[PDB]
């Protein structure tokens, strides 16, 4: 398995548990700091990073009824410059660029308590697919499915429904949607961290998946495994292999990595492409920093890069 060593450039640092790198519609860059604490209690932050200077600005410190959040993953919205944020303590949040936020739901479509979320991914139809490795959201005691299999997967539909699509995962983490050339959602890819497995489902429609299958295998015996992921324009899946010092690259068909990217740090956590470029921004937990490197090609367009009123 070939391994490349691209040049990594430091962007900024000192961001506890650096995660969820994302770009909004205007090209602004954001990341979350889920491990920031205050007196032993969660006080995670959402930050905007000035790429020119690397200077940080906390735009939001989510808290609901005295319960601080643990924001971990983000997705940019198309129909408005707002961010959807997976929070391990608060569930799903919608955050405005001015710092105002709102909790999306405390219960799913079946009326059961919402679980803490980790990452999310929009399909081109506007449906948001979410991984939920934590137990019930605040005020319930914080728990995570690292050992027990109670992690779930949700789909937040365009018509505002929060539907659990599956469960029994041992820490579902990264998640990505594979689209057909016609732009139709084809497959859902879900990372299950400790098991070193990538799972796939066939997407038949909103909140409708079937044919669960082991899609890929993550290398290493190390503690950890697949964390965040994203597709490049050719549908190659880049996966942060937390604890391995590498970012695995899978071909459209899955299986074993077609190649690996060696990182100058042991714990890559998540990644994201800068729109219209080959630039990938990577968050990592060794130094709690954000880095960037050049990929061999542009990233797959994110949902908020698509046009609602586009002819072609
Ligand atoms: Ca994650
Ligand atoms: Ca990403």
UniProtKB/Swiss-Prot annotation:
Keywords of the record: Calcium, Hydrolase, Metal-binding
Question: Kindly, how does the activity depend on pH for this protein?
Answer: Optimum pH is 8.0.
| Outcome recorded upon mutating residue 146 to A | 26% decrease in activity
Q: Per the record, what is the consequence of mutating residue 302 to W? A: 3% decrease in activity
User: Where are the active-site residues found?
Assistant: 285 (proton acceptor)
Cofactor(s) recorded in Swiss-Prot or TrEMBL: Ca(2+)
User: This protein's superkingdom?
Assistant: Eukaryota
Tell me the disulfide pairings in this chain: none
Q: What is the effect of changing residue 285 to Q?
A: 54% decrease in activity
Carries keyword Calcium? Answer: yes
User: Mutating residue 269 to A: effect?
Assistant: 30% increase in activity. 19% decrease in activity
- Residue positions binding Ca(2+) 1: 19, 118, 173, 227
* SUPFAM superfamilies (alphabetical): Calcium-dependent phosphotriesterase (SSF63829)
Q: Name the reaction it catalyses.
A: diisopropyl fluorophosphate + H2O = diisopropyl phosphate + fluoride + 2 H(+)
Q: Which GO terms describe its molecular function?
A: calcium ion binding; diisopropyl-fluorophosphatase activity
Detail which positions bind Ca(2+) 2. 230, 271-272
Cofactor binding annotation:
Binds 2 calcium ions per subunit.
Gene3D superfamilies, A to Z: TolB, C-terminal domain
Q: What is the effect of changing residue 171 to V?
A: 46% decrease in activity
Instruction: Give, from the UniProt record, the effect of changing residue 242 to Y.
Output: No effect on activity
Q: What does this protein do?
A: Biological function and substrate unknown. However, it is capable of acting on phosphorus anhydride bonds (such as phosphorus-halide and phosphorus-cyanide) in organophosphorus compounds (including nerve gases).
Q: What is this protein called?
A: Diisopropyl-fluorophosphatase
Q: List the source organism.
A: Loligo vulgaris
